[PDB]
Amino acid sequence: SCANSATSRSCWGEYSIDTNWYDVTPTGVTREYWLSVENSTITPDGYTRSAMTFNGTVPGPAIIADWGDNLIIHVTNNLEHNGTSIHWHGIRQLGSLEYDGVPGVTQCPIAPGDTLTYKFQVTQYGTTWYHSHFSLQYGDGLFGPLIINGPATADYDEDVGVIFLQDWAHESVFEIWDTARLGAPPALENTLMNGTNTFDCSASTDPNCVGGGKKFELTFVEGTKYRLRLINVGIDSHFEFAIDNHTLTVIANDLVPIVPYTTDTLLIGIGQRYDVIVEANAAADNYWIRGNWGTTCSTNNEAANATGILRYDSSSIANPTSVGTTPRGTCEDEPVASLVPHLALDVGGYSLVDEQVSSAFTNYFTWTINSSSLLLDWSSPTTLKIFNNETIFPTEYNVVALEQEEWVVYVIEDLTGFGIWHPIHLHGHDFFIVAQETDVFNSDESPAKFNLVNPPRRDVAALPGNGYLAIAFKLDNPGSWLLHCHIAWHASEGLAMQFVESQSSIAVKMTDTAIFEDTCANWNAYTPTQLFAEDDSGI
Ligand SMILES: *[C@@H]1O[C@H](CO)[C@@H](O[C@@H]2O[C@H](CO)[C@@H](O[C@@H]3O[C@H](CO[C@H]4O[C@H](CO[C@H]5O[C@H](CO)[C@@H](O)[C@H](O)[C@@H]5O[C@H]5O[C@H](CO)[C@@H](O)[C@H](O)[C@@H]5O)[C@@H](O)[C@H](O)[C@@H]4O)[C@@H](O)[C@H](O)[C@@H]3O)[C@H](O)[C@H]2NC(C)=O)[C@H](O)[C@H]1NC(C)=O
Ligand SMILES: *[C@@H]1O[C@H](CO)[C@@H](O[C@@H]2O[C@H](CO)[C@@H](O[C@@H]3O[C@H](CO)[C@@H](O)[C@H](O)[C@@H]3O)[C@H](O)[C@H]2NC(C)=O)[C@H](O)[C@H]1NC(C)=O
Ligand SMILES: *[C@@H]1O[C@H](CO)[C@@H](O)[C@H](O)[C@H]1NC(C)=O
Ligand SMILES: *[C@@H]1O[C@H](CO)[C@@H](O)[C@H](O)[C@H]1NC(C)=O
Ligand SMILES: *[C@@H]1O[C@H](CO)[C@@H](O)[C@H](O)[C@H]1NC(C)=O
Ligand SMILES: *[C@@H]1O[C@H](CO)[C@@H](O)[C@H](O)[C@H]1NC(C)=O
Ligand SMILES: *[C@@H]1O[C@H](CO)[C@@H](O)[C@H](O)[C@H]1NC(C)=O
Ligand SMILES: *[C@H]1O[C@H](CO)[C@@H](O)[C@H](O)[C@@H]1O
Ligand SMILES: [Cu+2]
Ligand SMILES: [Cu+2]
Ligand SMILES: [Cu+2]
């Protein structure tokens, strides 16, 4: 045993960075939270607008726990005109499928005025976030940080916490979805760094453009090592995070600690997390913090202003004049060779499932996976179907059945022709990136080039534009697991499928069945007279 400290971050008592957290979990304590999903008004960047929030702030409240703790999170929907459903990003939910928070898959939506208590253990440590998985709501601010303390692969002195990177509209995403769904994501009006940015309201006629937005600011004390927890939570944003004249030591990706590597800039797709350690070893000055919005990935009206300020002297009010590192300027992820899990694991014998992304136009632009666009019924989520002993699901549920070759390699191909790098998120599992390739998948040749020996391992990874992503995971978590592009427009357009894994091995407590039933009962009481019907894929 050793205690975690600034000079022994690898330690976690009897556990450590070498503990297999897929197999072993510390005993912790029960932590209880009450969250209210609210319809709010905020001014994050000098522009006043509506938001959908947890507890009236963007980001929502931090949920901070220790590895092994049991979370009880009472979520009350205080919106009037939407259901909601809260997902705990990257959280494995082993034995707690029904609290994954995917409406249409693991639950019915929480109706206005209802409460759903999510219960789960955190059997993972690091940086993640929680967010609505109900339509585009997280675009309107319905997300917050979820930090699980545990060991780390490099030493550091202070944890500064999360820095959210996002696009930010000056109106509700729900006002622009009808335009967006014609096929083209709109250029949004601004970006936020940890919930703030400047915006020039000086020439504006819009009463809501009140001005006074401020750059995100981060203060460093010289010689101190800081852990920063980077999350891209935009609707349709790509970042290449950098701090001028500072080196990032990358120590985790998503909820998987990695062998540390140094980089000047850090490519981050939507829903991806990185933990980096930054040593405040520069000349004391103000330095630009650069989101480096990927303009080739998607449009924004104020791409150049996706920045913040690092100060070594907090009393400085000067803008930085530092010179940035030339960004790679791509929509890629970090290179696979750089992302080596500290806890080394290999992909065993597998069955290969191949799926192909294309697009179509029905009522509006849709993405398809083997010709089918995901469209879920919020009143008949996949788990309800499973509880009713159904093994054949609607075509548009895009179900792939997995049954145990205890591993699956899932290859998703971009046949769309658009060359977009789609951040693909898999629920219920960390996956192994056996291939992430900019080329055409050849079912006879490509598999022999898969890396099965400790490849990158995480829960969000890019489908390369016009290429393929081959992700492996073990049949170790019975349930119904959504996989989707995390570009909110694309998710809403049906770029998604789901794995019904080991169906007959799913076990739910009567307590949790009653709860699920009750949520669906309340949802069904709501829908007859709702102001708004489902008008997207449901996820
Ligand atoms: C980007 O922007 C975000 C702001 O949006 C910034 O987030 C900040 O991130 C930092 C670092 O990650 C956080 O600092 C840490 O905060 C920890 C918690 O601090 C607070 O809560 C403590 C616990 O309070 C509960 O427990 C005690 C018993 O121990 C009770 O007395 C108390 O009533 C609470 O009980 C309730 O909750 C527990 C579950 O949590 C239940 O089980 C109970 O039944 C009950 O319902 C409290 O003692 C303390 O005084 C604080 O209120 C702290 O442990 C840690 O050491 C550190 O301070 C910030 O909290 C976070 N700020 C926000 C607003 O989220 C972020 O830093 C920024 N990034 C950058 C780079 O600037
Ligand atoms: C959840 O709640 C939001 C309200 O916060 C609903 O948003 C509304 O969505 C409708 C249907 O897309 C929007 O109507 C469209 O608006 C634009 C407005 O300029 C117009 O071009 C279109 O022809 C159409 O009328 C409406 O703007 C929007 N309302 C707000 C306040 O944003 C959303 O539908 C709800 N979804 C669910 C599933 O309950
Ligand atoms: C969030 O807001 C709700 C409703 O006011 C309140 O009951 C709950 O205690 C709040 N939770 C936090 C974490 O502030
Ligand atoms: C949020 O409140 C606004 C303003 O009252 C209203 O237009 C909107 O429908 C509400 N949205 C939801 C999802 O309840
Ligand atoms: C945005 O950046 C441009 C330079 O890229 C700068 O000239 C302009 O004043 C900035 N706007 C805001 C609101 O900070
Ligand atoms: C999807 O279609 C491709 C091309 O026809 C086929 O090879 C693949 O097996 C299909 N996948 C599934 C799960 O049906
Ligand atoms: C589903 O099958 C199980 C196992 O045979 C049975 O116990 C249960 O009653 C069935 N569920 C429904 C909804 O009929
Ligand atoms: C991560 O590591 C790989 C392999 O060394 C490099 O190629 C990459 O540039 C980054 O440093
Ligand atoms: Cu997510
Ligand atoms: Cu996409
Ligand atoms: Cu998801």
Domain-wise residue ranges, the chain: 1-151, 152-343, 344-539
Write out the E strands in 299-388. 307-311, 350-361, 365-369
Q: How far, in whole angstroms, is CA 254 from its chain's centroid? A: 9
Helix (H/G/I), strand (E/B), else coil: 402: strand
Phi, psi of 140 (to 5 degrees): -100, 15
Per-residue DSSP letters for 199-216? ---TT---TTB-------
Contact 84, 77 (CB under 8 A): yes
**Whole-angstrom distance, CA of residue 375 vs CA of residue 537:** 4
Residue 512: count other Cβ atoms within 10 Å of its Cβ. 17
C-alpha neighbours within 13 Å on the C-beta side of residue 459: 27
Phi-psi region of 181 (alpha: psi -120 to 50; beta: other; left: phi over 0): alpha
Q: Does domain 1-151 have CATH number 3.30.465.10?
A: no
Q: How far, in whole angstroms, is CA 533 from its chain's centroid? A: 26
What type of residue sits at position 129? Answer: W
CATH homologous superfamily for the domain 344-539: Cupredoxins -  blue copper proteins (2.60.40.420)
**Of the candidates 295, 290, 196, 289, the residue with the CA atom closest to the CA atom of residue 236:** 295
**Whole-angstrom distance, CA of residue 199 vs CA of residue 304:** 12
150: tokens are 């545990």
Residue 466: count other Cβ atoms within 10 Å of its Cβ. 17
**Whole-angstrom distance, CA of residue 441 vs CA of residue 40:** 46
Q: Which ligand is nearest to the CA of 319?
A: 5
**Whole-angstrom distance, CA of residue 219 vs CA of residue 312:** 6
C-alpha neighbours within 13 Å on the C-beta side of residue 484: 33
Q: Which ligand is nearest to the CA of 218?
A: 1
**Of the candidates 474, 457, 467, 475, the residue with the CA atom closest to the CA atom of residue 356:** 467
Query: Which atom of ligand 2 lies closest to the CA of 176?
Result: 17
List the residue whose alpha carbon is closest to atom 4 of ligand 1.
59
C-alpha neighbours within 13 Å on the C-beta side of residue 463: 32
| Burial class of residue 362 (count of CB atoms within 10 Å of its CB; 0-12, 13-18, 19+) | exposed
For ligand 10, the distance from its centroid to the CA atom of residue 30, given in whole angstroms, is 37
List the residue whose alpha carbon is closest to atom 7 of ligand 3.
34
Strand partners, 41: 50
Q: Which ligand is nearest to the CA of 425?
A: 11
| Burial class of residue 494 (count of CB atoms within 10 Å of its CB; 0-12, 13-18, 19+) | buried
Q: In what order do the strands lie in the sheet with 407-414?
A: 365-369, 350-361, 407-414, 468-474, 431-437, 457-458
Domains 1-151 and 152-343 share a fold: yes
Entry resolution (Å):
1.7
Contact 269, 423 (CB under 8 A): yes
DSSP state of 108: P
Contact 374, 484 (CB under 8 A): yes
- 197 CB near ligand 4 (under 6 Å): no
Q: How far, in whole angstroms, is CA 40 from its chain's centroid? A: 23
- 338 CB near ligand 8 (under 6 Å): yes
Phi, psi of 38 (to 5 degrees): -125, 155
Tell me the residue length of the chain.
539
List the residue whose alpha carbon is closest to atom 7 of ligand 2.
174
C-alpha neighbours within 13 Å on the C-beta side of residue 219: 6
- CATH fold for the domain made of 152-343: Immunoglobulin-like (2.60.40)
Structure-token match 């940080």, residue found: 145
**Whole-angstrom distance, CA of residue 423 vs CA of residue 101:** 19
Query: What counts of helices (H) and strands (E) characterise the chain?
Result: 4, 32
Question: Hey, which of 530, 532, 537, 539 would you mutate to test ligand 2's pocket, going by the most ligand atoms within 8 Å of its Cβ?
Answer: 532
**Interior/surface letters 161-193, b for 16+ CB within 10 angstroms, e for the rest:** ebbbbbbbbbebbbebbeebbeeebbebbbbbb
Cis omega (within 30 of 0) for bond into 423? no
**Whole-angstrom distance, CA of residue 113 vs CA of residue 526:** 10
Cβ neighbours of residue 360 closer than 8 Å, sequence gap 6 or more: 366, 368, 371, 373
Q: Are strands 399-402 and 496-501 parallel, antiparallel or unpaired?
A: parallel
Phi, psi of 71 (to 5 degrees): -100, 135
**Interior/surface letters 373-396, b for 16+ CB within 10 angstroms, e for the rest:** bbbbbbbbbbbbbbeeeeeebeeb
**Whole-angstrom distance, CA of residue 483 vs CA of residue 126:** 21
Question: Hey, which of 36, 37, 38, 39 would you mutate to test ligand 4's pocket, going by the most ligand atoms within 8 Å of its Cβ?
Answer: 39
198: tokens are 């400047």
Cβ neighbours of residue 448 closer than 8 Å, sequence gap 6 or more: none
